[PDB]
Structures are given as structure tokens and as C-alpha cells.
Design a protein around this ligand. Structure first.
Ligand code: COA
Length: 172
């Protein structure tokens, strides 16, 4: 069904189209982002993926040839922790139970290296869709970082969540 393949610039025009406004970019990728999404805005992230070993891995979720989502992994190899980030489905792919398959695939990649013992993520407290999806995928809420992210005149709270390898294995 859904496949995760390495992200490539060849997929950038598809990805760029999923964000209509600055706010949608910020929700996805944080307060540094500006609309339209541009390759220049992704340079630091992509360079992280060219380090050896790689600090970030970027992924495109595809169905056959069609790019329908994006996700990232950030590696803390000293501690054996990976952070999930920048998870999005194309707007036309939302509401079709593709959220969970994408998370399950991403988790598989995160735990592929046997030295990873923990996976984690941040989610804005108001991002109810994302938060429920993460819980369904087996993530436990671990805390709430108050007034952490500045966006305009607002400050957003960040829910922290985590999943241990033995929990991930127990669930599947
Ligand atoms: C987060 C995202 C990947 C989820 O996609 P999806 O799985 O199709 O999400 P949906 O819109 O179907 O909602 C998913 C689930 O949450 C539940 N849910 C709870 N509150 C919800 C809300 N406000 N809207 C939609 N679903 C909600 C749904 O019922 C569904 O679960 P169920 O089958 O158990 O009922 C998608 O919304 C997205 O790409 N959003 C924009 C980017 C973003 O916010 N990224 C996350 C942080 S980077």
C-alpha cells in the first residue's frame, strides 16, 4: 500500500504544493518557515542528511509513483534516540486512514538500527489530528513544554511524546 522511499529534490515540487500559507508551513516545520516553501529553506536540513553518519533522514511516502506525504527522522546516535518530525500527508490524501500506515512505516525505519532504543516527537498541543494519530501509533504523552514556540503574537505549547523499542515491539 503506502511506501517510504528516500526524499529527493525530484519530489520537492509536490511537497511545496501542500502548503498554501505561512501558517500551514509553520504548523508543519516551525516558526522559521516563510511562504512559499523554497529549496533554500531546506538546505540546512538536507545538508544534515549528507553527513556521515547522517544527522537527519528525509522520506517521501508514496503510493506506487505518487508522492502523498513527507516525514523526517533526526538521529541522536550517542543516546540511541530518534525524533520523528515534519510528518505531513498531501491534503488530498488526508482522512483516508493513511496517517497510521505512514507512522508504522516511519517507526519501522526509526527502529531498523538495533542501537535505537527510543523514538520521540513534539506536537503542538492544539494539533488534535496529529496528537490522536500519534497516540494511536502507540506514543505515550510525556510532558507539556509551556509557551515554547513564538509565532507572531502567540506562543504555542509543545506536547512531548515517546515510544520505547519494547513497547513498539509489543504493539507490533
Ligand atoms: C497529521 C496528519 C498527517 C493526519 O492525517 P490523517 O491521518 O488523514 O488525519 P485525519 O485528518 O484523518 O485525522 C486522523 C485521526 O484523528 C482523529 N481526530 C481527532 N481530532 C481530529 C480533527 N480535528 N481532525 C481530523 N481528525 C481528528 C480522527 O477521527 C482520525 O482517527 P480515527 O480513525 O480513530 O477516528 C494530517 O492531518 C496532516 O498532514 N496535517 C498537516 C500537517 C501537520 O500538522 N503535521 C503534523 C506535525 S508536523
Amino acid at each position: 500500500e503506502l511506501q517510504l522511499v528516500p526524499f529527493q529534490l525530484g519530489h520537492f515540487p509536490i511537497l511545496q504544493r501542500w502548503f498554501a500559507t505561512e501558517k500551514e508551513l509553520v504548523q508543519w516545520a516551525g516558526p522559521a518557515l516563510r511562504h512559499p516553501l523554497s529549496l533554500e529553506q531546506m538546505h540546512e536540513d538536507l545538508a544534515e542528511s549528507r553527513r556521515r553518519p547522517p544527522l537527519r533522514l528525509l522520506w517521501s511516502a508514496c503510493r506506487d509513483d505518487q508522492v502523498i506525504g513527507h516525514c523526517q527522522l533526526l538521529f541522536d546516535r550517542r543516546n540511541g534516540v530518534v525524533r520523528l518530525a515534519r510528518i505531513v500527508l498531501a491534503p488530498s490524501a488526508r482522512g483516508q486512514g493513511l496517517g497510521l500506515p505512514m507512522l508504522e512505516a516511519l517507526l519501522a525505519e526509526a527502529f531498523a538500527d538495533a542501537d535505537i532504543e527510543r523514538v520521540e516527537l513534539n506536537v503542538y498541543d492544539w494539533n488534535a489530528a496529529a496528537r490522536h494519530l500519534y497516540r494511536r501509533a502507540g506514543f505515550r504523552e510525556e510532558g507539556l513544554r509551556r509557551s515554547a514556540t513564538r509565532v507572531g503574537r502567540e506562543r504555542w505549547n509543545v506536547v512531548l511524546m515517546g515510544l520505547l523499542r519494547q513497547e513498539w515491539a509489543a504493539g507490533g
